[PDB]
């Protein structure tokens, strides 16, 4: 029965994080589709362990420790190519492919794994055949990759090209709390349907470049689009976006949001916890809250202290001087399905790079910055699981804790770090 090490953090069905050894039958862990996964057993035992680590300069590596028999949920890209080569004076048509095959393991077991297969036919016999293969491959699957599992210990059996192309995955968090919404209700008595939107946005601006002792943040002047947004939004919360305006020689216009009748914005900043212990913080509940709220929040942050580039794909960069926020950002961004990486600018400053196609466009379409806004996706889109390459390190023996799911379930659940791992069970 594959398992994990003690302390392994698991994401609960309700969005809470829990240490695997503290999990008890009946509890529901988080399913990758956002739905619960009831725990029905708790494997125990000793066994060689393997630490899983992302291969990759501020580290933000995805990782977890498992036992040797733990089934890694992996994906390998499908692949096909035809080439012509001359072998020993004879020209051949060769088709190299990635397909599911077999390999005798050290213990004599037959392990089913993706393999790089090669097939060649003499040119004299013609192409058809090579095509009846390249053709059957391309239409043998509706997917562009293989979805499978391999035991940690068996990962060494993979050929070099397949091993390097094989990756694990972390799923976006589709479950949605309402800590933010439920908060709104507790606020005043009357407020527009777009109250949650407007506040999350303003909080993003605050976290971006706002003072830590007052509902005041700075914004760029040449950005008339962003200004109209602040003003427009403040008003939605009966606030005044006050600033010296064109009578204060400067480029970074300080914007003061007063109660305009101890106000909504700041009451949330403290109530929700965007400022814990005098220092800025990214509330942990964000990650598992309303998706629209998560995006709106990021759009604000991006609008106050970040930039967007499109050279080699749409990408957003947010700069933060605090490590608390930094790691909070990486978590919140990954929860939407964005691909994230961090670097240290002249370590005083921190840059969080985010990419993700439609997932990123769904955030930027909420920004107001002149060079930040990007039109929303051209259509509905699913938030695909993201892959990460990894390194496996064989460890000595230790106690392991596994979790078994129902018989009808997909047999998968998420770790606190969103990594999609396999249920602990026989087979």
From Swiss-Prot:
It comes from the Eukaryota. This is Endonuclease PI-SceI. Residues 202-338 form the DOD-type homing endonuclease domain.
């Amino acid at each position: 029965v594959g398992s994990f090490a003690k302390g392994t953090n698991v994401l609960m069905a309700d969005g809470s994080i829990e240490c695997i050894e503290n999990i008890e039958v009946g509890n529901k862990v988080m399913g990758k589709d956002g739905r619960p996964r009831e725990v029905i057993k708790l494997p125990r035992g000793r066994e060689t362990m393997y630490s899983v680590v992302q291969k990759s300069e501020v580290p933000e590596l995805l990782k977890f420790t498992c036992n040797a028999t733990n089934e890694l949920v992996v994906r390998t890209p499908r692949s096909v190519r035809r080439l012509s080569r001359t072998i020993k004076g004879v020209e051949y048509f060769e088709v190299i492919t990635f397909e599911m095959g077999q390999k005798k393991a050290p213990d004599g077991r037959i392990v089913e794994l993706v393999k790089e297969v090669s097939k060649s036919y003499p040119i004299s016999e013609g192409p058809e055949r090579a095509n009846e293969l390249v053709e059957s491959y391309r239409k043998a699957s509706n997917k562009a990759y293989f979805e499978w599992t391999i035991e940690a210990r068996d990962l060494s059996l993979l050929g070099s090209h397949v091993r390097k192309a094989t990756y694990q995955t972390y799923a976006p968090i589709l479950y949605e709390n309402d800590h933010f919404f439920d908060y709104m209700q507790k606020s005043k008595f009357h407020l527009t349907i777009e109250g949650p939107k407007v506040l999350a946005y303003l909080l993003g601006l605050w976290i971006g470049d706002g003072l830590s002792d007052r509902a005041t943040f700075s914004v760029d002047s040449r950005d008339t689009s962003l200004m109209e947004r602040v003003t427009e939004y403040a008003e939605k919360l009966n606030l005044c976006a006050e600033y010296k305006d064109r009578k204060e020689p400067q480029v970074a216009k300080t914007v003061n949001l007063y109660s305009k009748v101890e106000n909504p914005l700041w009451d949330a900043i403290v109530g929700l916890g965007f400022l814990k212990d005098g220092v800025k913080n990214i509330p942990s509940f964000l990650s598992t809250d309303n998706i629209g709220t998560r995006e709106t929040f990021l759009a604000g942050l991006i609008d106050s202290d970040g930039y967007v580039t499109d050279e080699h794909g749409i990408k957003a960069t947010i700069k933060t001087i605090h490590t608390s926020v930094r790691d909070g950002l990486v978590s919140l961004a990954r929860s939407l399905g964005l691909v994230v990486s961090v670097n240290a600018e002249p370590k005083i400053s921190y840059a969080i790079y985010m990419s993700g196609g439609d997932v990123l466009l769904n955030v930027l379409s909420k920004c107001a910055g002149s060079k930040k806004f990007r039109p929303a996706p051209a259509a509905a889109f699913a938030r695909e699981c993201r892959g990460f390459y990894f390194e496996l390190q064989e460890l000595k023996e230790d106690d392991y804790y596994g979790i078994t799911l129902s018989d009808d379930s997909d047999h998968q659940f998420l770790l606190a770090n969103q990594v999609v791992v396999h249920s602990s069970g026989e087979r």
